[PDB]
Amino acid sequence: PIKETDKEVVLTHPADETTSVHILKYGATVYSWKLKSEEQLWLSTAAKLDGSKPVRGGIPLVFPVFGKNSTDEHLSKLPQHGLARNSTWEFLGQTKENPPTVQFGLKPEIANPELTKLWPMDYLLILTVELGSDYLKTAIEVENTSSSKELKFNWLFHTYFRIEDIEGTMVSNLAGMKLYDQLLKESYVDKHPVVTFNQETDVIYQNVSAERAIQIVDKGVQIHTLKRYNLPDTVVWNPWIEKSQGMADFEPKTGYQQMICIEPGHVHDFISLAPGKKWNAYQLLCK
């Protein structure tokens, strides 16, 4: 079933109503995904769901810039992570009853007014959210609706996975991959067989294909699996103690212990889309 309210859309799986996803129209932000009653995403207890600022948790959408840009004339004018996550998307309706599937849209005319003036590029976004019995798929299509100008952008899904304890968690299937370390400001190959956590980390793994599933493991159990299509980068982020303290809408301050962000995207460089042309990708979350 699908249920629309003024602020959100909620999908429940027809075989089991305790499997659900809640999507805020603001940012088209998934902020809860329950699998048979069990919450799969981390959301700050102080997250704003009222459209006052981006949602701290769930799956914020990152477009058209990942991070803060300094050198592009127009992208450098935008705040960190762009304008998709602070614009109210239009619910386009349901496309399927089983698996329950819905679409959301954004275009300059309905996007964040201040930010649209800073970056007045033509585009159309369509987000498709599909709720399976044992997975969540979030797919994106971007269309360059200009007839003359190329459209230059990054795309990233800022997925916050919920875990029990970051220090006892590991992430597998990234051994031997190249990364850019945003904290150290250097690139290197990750030579370790798994990723483990003891401090702030902010790394961008590269060359991750549709064939390379990433697993999050706790007490020997794969508690989360992430697959993707057409998103060659993966950001791995945890704020740790100090950064968490500084984030006003991040609570509890120990909350970094129950989250890990593993964020598929195209962020190592910009996609340049010719006029009239389309680009598409998705991420797929399961257990």
Ligand code: NA
């Ligand atoms: Na606070």
